[PDB]
Design a binder for this molecule. Structure first.
Ligand code: CA
Ligand code: CA
Ligand code: CA
Ligand code: CA
Lengths: 639, 639
């Protein structure tokens, strides 16, 4: 960076020189009228070149050389080290007329060199490197650079700032700035609701960190100390990327020069750092489970016992929650979504919370919390796929899946606010599916993903009505038509539901053929958008009843919405027709899954209610370890 | 794209097959209970593979082959040509039990194959190619693809649609769609204020083009005709990219299947095209001039005569405009900005118009018009550089320059609406300069660009107060101190302004040293952001007076704001001190410019007023040929 500094004759110009720049200096304007040639002297640590018509020659500290005065003959002035108290850094230009060799006048330039660098961890290793040449830009990918900021998801203490990003103003120079200069850190009005910055303003009086930049504070004057100094700042993100906010914010430092009263100060030098605020990332079922969270009524004893036994097979911890006045019976599934954020050498799980009636809970200090309508707004209507590659395009964090209706249908859709939020995170490249054929309208009623044990691969599990009808027709042919559904649920008994009764219900057959079309439309989108083939899919038997809106509700519990802990699957107990004292649905599902090394445990969430009307009264959710792949190494498509 | 189509037993499934997809077909669900094996027949133009556990084998039209019935054994069905009236396209599956070789049941699939493709000129040659594989994406650069739309800048006639983009729905098939299908073209609500689409709905009754998609119309059912058919649509953009709008819009066509009353229609097949709306592009002074526009009062005879003589030296045409009640005296410069838009084989000049008092003009049908506060909002405060390369980064269309104040100054700034508009065009990557030290606050008061004749290079011209003082001091030393400014302007005469009077004014010297600092701050930004060195810059003498806000107004006309027609420069006549009966400012400027092959003509815009107070009462603007470089070949930085 070249900076213009002009001389003034019979006089002196004093300037601050910032290392990393150089000055170009007009000597011709300060020349007295009638002056013909000039000569110059300079101090030891100032380097001076005479540049005439583009050609630069180095000039000695004291030579007697003279050059013709011309507007196209200028000086270039460079300094490689900061001034100290021992410095006298200067350049002196002498002017001559034709008549003689004694100077007729002189113009000086007195310099104070300082180093000023606003530094951040741009190379993404957790340490703040000195003046990364790329710190003012932010690029994606394995070779990408620029600093990363976490949203704060939770006078100040340093301990409380542990989650924030460090930013360091590094300076070097003499005891004080020359008269009429100051250093100011600042942000734009636009970024003021995106960031905050903390600093100890008065270190002689204690360690108190104060909030110096953010809402209503756009600039802060920072004190200069001499010698080699560092000022430590902590920076927080205030919000995630969203529809109108890309995630990028900038912070500037400027050396300002006082001109006079009533006139703005001149920005002599400006240094800039950029941060990207880390996106919220959802964890698919293939990631290692850490904790299992469940909610149910206190007396659903079978559910609790069976979930405990499942979790005991694993190294996971179980967290049990009961029901709240402000939340649905499924809230741990519907109102909470587990995700994470990550920065170099920092990261934590972050829960999205959308309470049904609003907030009046939380499990643990380890989590960050982001707190916010149709049933499509539920987090039961959100899933995320395992990492996939689709037609050469890699989605290393997987893709978020959101249930919706057909574009021209006039049906329900998840609120734009949430859809836009998920899209703005960019790294999970969301896909809309079709959930609106379901009364409740959640993708988790029809699909799930499971890892294939001993491999790096996974399966898509799809609810299938065709599979249920095939199985029931086989069992009927085998002489089992009188086999009864819902054994042990006393509130169902009077209905006497048998395989025969189901198969003879003509309207129900038609309804379920239609629901199979709905499932298949989704199957196709999933195969297209996830790059899946038929070998990646297993169909689980399912059955639905139709409501007045022509929408589906489960006839028996949807087995697809299951607890996935690696090889171990907690599967809703279906209460299917008993053949030889085993549920034919359980046996069929075992026959599909067990050969793949998956271990099935059926979990009874309905016995405590004595019947099943299509609604499940419990919920589960799993906190998982984040992906090994660092999100900033992705190269998302440009928008 | 693989699509799921299942059989149903003892019965027939009829389906439409869209060319370019294929069907995967479950034969196992239609198998009667107890059935063991299956066999199949198919027609000549249907290709059928049996796929078992991933392994596909082609099956003959009539073989007797039998396969074990399994859920993992399916059919893949492919057709390579559209059905005609001569087609019977089908696949028939026979099922067998253990007991014998006569089929116990059969399930048919009857097919009607159609071609459906929504086509646009994605490869950017002006012709609509058949089904470009990349038409659903939009990529920048030499190899980039996807279709381009122009904003319309001006029952319908086809002639009136000449400026719009063509979009063609190409179909092939039998006489009619099978029962229960329709084809629908549609857009999102969001895009509905970005685009419009026109089509002849009733070609038997005439050629009337009607507006079928746009505000309040999100979908249109289009009639299917048999055989090979094309439906021609015309598409317009409604607005330029802006803060919340990237410029990308999408149009979809879907084949919809009727399910039943009260149930949404199923999107069987969907095809999508994307368009980018072409940005507004500003033309720098290096581009060939076409027309010169001037505004002045009818009696400024010298200005008119001298501008006419200048333009007569060139092949340009002159357009003369007088003053209007709703517009400033400079309006052709301040309220109008000339730019263009371009699409493959189409483009026109487009004027931005921001009338002072609002609209109540226009010159010519050849232009598009975009019609919309401090003085910084004026188009005199906008410039655009010639193409530059900065640290390896190429700006093939140049960069827009916008005058502003310092970030912390609390000074004036161009309105966000305009700044955001210019930024959103993306291809000119705007840079903010510092104009707020000027009373009027326009970058055109201090800088301009000129081409260097006989080369591909250009110069930055900067106003310089230091150059003026140097020149005046020289002339004083030479014995010319009593030389008078403003000769011939009778309203200035009583002031008796001479070189001596100017040089002895101490406050004026200080003011102009400060203004030179302001000019130099800009010089530095321009060198940085345009990749310029001192060899690319010429300083023209200028002088200013300071107002109560410490802002500058011209002491004598600013020569830098000049008419640039290639080698010929119309330069405001400065009315400088006369030495040997020539203006020393004119002679100095000639001495700078003429050696470079630039021809200078001084244009007197103030004599008709008898004095000069810092305000010029005329304006000029030049319509230029667009860049040869196609904007869509740029690769702008991602945001
Ligand atoms: Ca680092
Ligand atoms: Ca979920
Ligand atoms: Ca084409
Ligand atoms: Ca302009």
């Amino acid at each position: 960076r070249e900076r213009t500094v002009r001389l003034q004759y019979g006089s002196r110009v004093e300037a601050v020189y910032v290392l990393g720049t150089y000055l170009w200096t007009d000597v011709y304007s300060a020349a007295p009228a009638g002056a013909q040639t000039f000569s110059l002297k300079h101090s030891e640590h100032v380097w001076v070149e005479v540049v005439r018509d583009g050609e630069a020659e180095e000039v000695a500290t004291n030579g007697k050389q003279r050059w013709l005065l011309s507007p196209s003959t200028t000086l270039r002035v460079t300094m490689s080290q900061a001034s100290t108290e021992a410095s006298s850094d200067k350049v002196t230009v002498n002017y001559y007329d034709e008549e003689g060799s004694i100077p007729i006048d002189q113009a000086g330039l007195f310099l104070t060199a300082i180093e000023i660098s606003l530094d951040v961890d741009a190379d993404r290793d957790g340490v703040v490197e000195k003046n990364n040449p790329k710190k003012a830009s932010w690029t994606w990918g394995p070779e990408g650079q620029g600093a990363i900021l976490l949203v704060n998801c939770d006078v100040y203490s340093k301990e409380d700032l542990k989650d924030m990003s460090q930013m360091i103003l590094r300076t070097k120079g003499p005891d004080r700035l020359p008269a009429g200069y100051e250093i100011v850190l600042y942000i734009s009005m636009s970024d003021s609701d995106k960031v905050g910055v903390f600093y100890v303003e008065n270190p002689f009086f204690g360690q108190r960190y104060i909030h110096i930049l953010g809402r209503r504070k756009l600039y802060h004057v920072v004190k200069y100390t001499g010698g080699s100094a560092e000022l430590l700042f902590f920076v927080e993100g205030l919000c995630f990327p969203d529809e109108g906010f890309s995630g990028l914010v900038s912070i500037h430092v400027s050396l300002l020069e006082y001109m006079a009263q009533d006139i703005p100060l001149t920005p002599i030098f400006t240094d800039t750092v950029i941060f990207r605020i880390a996106p919220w990332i959802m964890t698919p079922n293939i990631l290692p489970p850490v904790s299992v969270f469940v909610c149910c009524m206190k007396d659903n004893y079978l559910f609790l016992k069976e979930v405990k036994n499942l979790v005991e097979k694993t190294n996971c911890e179980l967290k049990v929650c009961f029901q709240y006045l402000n939340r649905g019976d499924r809230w741990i599934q519907d109102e909470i979504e587990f995700g994470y954020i990550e920065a170099p050498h920092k990261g934590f799980p972050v829960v999205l919370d959308s309470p049904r009636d609003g907030n009046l809970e939380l499990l643990g200090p380890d989590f960050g919390y982001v707190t916010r309508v149709t049933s499509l707004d539920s987090f039961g209507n959100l899933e995320v796929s395992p990492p996939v590659t689709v037609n050469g395009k890699t989605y290393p964090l997987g893709r978020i899946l959101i249930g919706s209706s057909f574009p021209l249908s006039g049906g329900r859709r998840m609120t734009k606010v949430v859809r836009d939020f998920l899209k703005a995170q960019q790294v999970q490249a969301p896909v809309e599916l079709y959930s609106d054929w379901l009364t409740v309208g959640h993708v988790d009623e029809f699909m799930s993903f499971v890892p294939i044990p001993g491999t790096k691969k996974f399966l898509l599990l799809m609810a299938s009505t065709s599979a249920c009808y095939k199985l029931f027709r086989e069992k009927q042919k085998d002489g089992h038509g009188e086999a009864i559904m819902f054994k042990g649920l006393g509130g169902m008994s009077s209905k006497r539901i048998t395989i025969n009764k189901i198969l003879s219900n003509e309207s129900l057959v038609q309804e379920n053929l239609y629901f199979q079309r709905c499932l298949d439309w989704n199957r196709d989108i999933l195969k297209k958008e996830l790059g899946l083939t038929e070998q990646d899919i297993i169909d689980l038997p399912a059955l639905f009843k139709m409501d007045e809106d022509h929408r589906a509700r489960a006839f028996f519990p949807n087995m697809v919405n299951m607890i996935v802990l690696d090889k171990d699957l907690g599967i809703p107990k279906p209460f299917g027709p008993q053949v030889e004292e085993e549920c034919c649905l359980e046996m069929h599902v075992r026959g599909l899954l067990e050969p793949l090394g998956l271990e099935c445990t059926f979990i009874d969430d309905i016995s405590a209610y004595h019947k099943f009307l299509g609604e499940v009264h419990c919920g589960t959710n799993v906190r998982r370890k984040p992906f090994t792949f660092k999100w900033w190494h992705m190269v998302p498509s440009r928008r």
